């Protein structure tokens, strides 16, 4: 129908079912415009922001943002979030004494965040030495996201202002203590920026809009996504209903469609790849914190598939994402530096389209040549076993050296292992494990975790 | 009908009765909503805020106001007031001599507070050092409710500026007590922020927007009402109706009624139920103060029932929910580390499913490791006597021995003994009951007081 | 009728008679009102501001105005006017040298202000060491009527910036003095603070609402009213109209009516009760200034009933109430902590239950416990003697004996006599009065007047 009840240029029939963009005008979602690049979206038909960006959903979904915003956030379901962050890459103490601070901003947001100010502690141990703001030479005009101030192949600025003052360790007692090898460090308690918006003479104002405004509506009607490349990070707030509240229309998806979603990763078919790298649920390691681990461990047995891509997401929810850095498939990926022991590839009782066929045992020699010191990993894998006869153990050299028992389950089953190891001139990290019999083993990984 | 008297979009009759909204209109309230998860509101038909908060009540109820505001508040009787305080974690003193303090901002209110400007003073005992005011590196730009600046994880802000100046003790006749072992305390007269609304232009604006606006009304037409948990406290508002006021048509309702709105405890028939912790009124310890205390026993003679959750809420109540530390009922829950002597769980005349057949005296014992030193306790419990022949007296090993005698009733009462315990490394506690002949007990509970 | 002259929605024929607000319309008053606990109103037909306030008169009598005001200015004839002040706490000075003084603001009127900025003076003997303006870290936010800054329990603020500046005395001159005996005292010259509206949109403001553009405009148009209950302070200021003006529609009423109507004493048929505290005028005493005890003396003399309470209210009249500490009146209450001697309650012919039927002399014996040092005191009470024959004196032991004579009349009179009191530990006051035949006594009475 024609009946809009929220006032943001889409009917609540296009709304609440399935809507595209076509000439600046909303029209109904045909099945056939999926070959042409229209992508479908849905919203909420009683609020004008779904997300609790500054954009309402019309805007968003037309384009009639800000262009330097990401296309990932003109999905209503994602909100347009500056994530900002601040790295000190060369501090300097001399004379009490006078401290130095070289920093370097960090944006990994879905929108640009201008007229950058954040706010720093100079941390020591626990105590905090002083907090300090961004004066008037240390704010970032532009920011824009997956980007830098100062940009790329410049060298950073510094930090020596306190109000026209300069930065001390009153006490030279904090000189002594330093002297014992304790460091300083810098985090980034609140970060302040304006965004931008077009008047009604057609230009661009980001004078009166702040940021701050809009972080406590979308830190809580969202749930945080995080992704892990390595050498990048990528976050994300997808918004997600209330449960108790009848009179919340967000629209009910997927863990795996909100990832989709979120990150425009490209699906072939069935699986997911973000730039080439695949993120796919059996090819990626994740993490939640306790109440979603509570939250998909409840919901997983209600559902057959026992997928946690397939579970809904709901409101409050953390999901990081790490993609490991050593993973084979023995299909089209194995980035090993050192072969493997008792492969065998013609099988077809895989994961996808081939498994490993391991008749004994199986071990690794990997150099520490290519591995981070003083870093805790993990090594996790798919095994099958229909026979449910055989007791596999595993024997992982490290620090301290782990042995432990593993019972195969009739189909898929994937084992998490964490060790530790320390020193980069220490001994060789050394990973053996042994099958009584012909055991089944797909998608090992190596992923990092926290140091 | 169709009549509004205060123009906020809800009819007179609506709002007299219950009402309800839906699709951004407001409905006659039905009890066949209540399946559905819909919800009775009631409010004043004369007045267009009914709590004095600045949303009206049309906002409050359709939820049309900010995402950050906790559903608490939704009720157009329940105001959305931010209760923002500040304490102490560090003291960091240094030379005359200069003083540094570490400081977190924490809000147990049920709105957020932007651009948080708390002002403290730094009394060390009587005498006031200074009289301090947030300065710019001190703001927090944004603060939800349950949620701290800076935020979990992060090192409190260091507070040293004082006007750019630097905080000190102008003599050492403060020293020398400080040498003897006196604490500066820091304690927070007022606090500053904004609030957020709505423009013309779709965005929020929380400039204008001031909250020391709105206190003084919130504060005079509302009866304070706080629960504590032992770790997490929450303190609400409820707007209530006046006295002598003919024109006054803020609805009536009973401490129960409120406590429900205020925490949005589900109650499952006849008990209350928070967060899996009960709050009713045979689980819990209530205090109150001089006027609410004597406006309660003067109303409670004129109820046969003689329960507090059935006492209208009048304006000006303060009243304090104190979630005892240990409690056992004999039936679902018990707490205690260690058991207890001469229970008998064999009966029928318990509060709600069983109470305890005693014949005799009970003694327990709490071990020394788990109790506060330098703290008061109280001890309570339900005891009923039809017999109203056995006399109880109670022995309390303590800092100081305590023995007093009880006269049970025929129907069930509460008994309130107070003790006081000082010292980690000293005696055990050790509490003691004797009953002449057979009595009946239940709900024995262990409530923490200030020291 | 339809006749509104002022335009402030009140009909002039229902200003010049009685009038009530009912559902936010202003209806005709009749008198079956006042059973259902409605109030009359009166207010001038050619203001919209009776009283001088920002508030109008439909504002002040439907209540439309900020819920913090205290409902005895919701009558017009009463304006809502704060009556701030700063109190003196504690004087702390250390090393020329620098003086720190730690304050605490008090509201004693009907209205709260905003953003309280009191000027202060430091005067050590008729010189004033400097004049200081307080700054933001002394700025109260919120000051409610009978509430302070800091509130109950909170420590109070302490005043040592003078512009960054620390207070200074240039000389040790005022340093001798303070060893002599002299004190500093601290005076507040005048506040600056705001009051509430309600903008366009529905929001209150208090940014440009300055009170000192209302505390001339309020002061030329009223008539002081103070009520000292011992430990509190009432100051109110009543409308009254112009003499010689014909213009001025300004309501005529009794001192009595306007006392009940500024403190909204409850009056149960004829007595006046404030807070279950007697404010009738046989009850408390009565303290004006010259032209305002010459103008009621002169009205009395045309006057029948001869009593103040009966005067009529004229514009500049300055009353002060003092409630005596101890009164007794032989009939309930009799606070005296000795009781009197040769006291006969057989009698009918008291002031309004009972007299003292006296035959020879009445002495007390009054210990210092019960009395303040360095304290003016006025001996007050009834006298009646129907034969006119029997001359009365007292004695009275105090700093300076005084012994004298009274010469009843036929009727009620009343008698004062003032004495002072110096030193806690001097000799015990003694009073003694003799009378020659038979005398009527009631209501004697005790106040603590200036130091
Ligand atoms: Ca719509
Ligand atoms: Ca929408
Ligand atoms: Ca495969
Ligand atoms: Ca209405
Ligand atoms: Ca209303
Ligand atoms: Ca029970
Ligand atoms: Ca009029
Ligand atoms: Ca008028
Ligand atoms: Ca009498």
Known sequence: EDLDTDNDNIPDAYEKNGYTIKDSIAVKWNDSFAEQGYKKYVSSYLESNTAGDPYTDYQKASGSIDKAIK???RDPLVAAYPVVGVGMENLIISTSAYINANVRYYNTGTAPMYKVTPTTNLVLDGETLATIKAQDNQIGNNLSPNETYPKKGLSPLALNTMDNARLIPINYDQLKKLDSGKQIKLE???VSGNYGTKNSQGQIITEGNSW???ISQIDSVSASIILDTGSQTFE???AAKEQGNPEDKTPEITIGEAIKKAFSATKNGELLYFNGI???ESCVELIFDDNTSEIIKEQLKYLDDKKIYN?????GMNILIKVPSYFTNFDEYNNFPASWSNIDTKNQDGLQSVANKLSGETKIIIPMSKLKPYKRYVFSGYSKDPST???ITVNIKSKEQKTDYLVP????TKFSYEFETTGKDSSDIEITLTSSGVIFLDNLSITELNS
């Open 71 to 73: 296309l990932e956030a």
């Open 188 to 190: 980034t308690t609140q």
């Open 212 to 214: 701050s405004n809009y």
């Open 236 to 238: 994300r707030r997808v």
């Open 278 to 280: 695949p993120i796919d």
């Open 311 to 315: 579970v809904k997401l709901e409101r």
């Open 389 to 391: 006869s055989n007791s």
């Open 409 to 412: 389950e009739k189909d898929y």
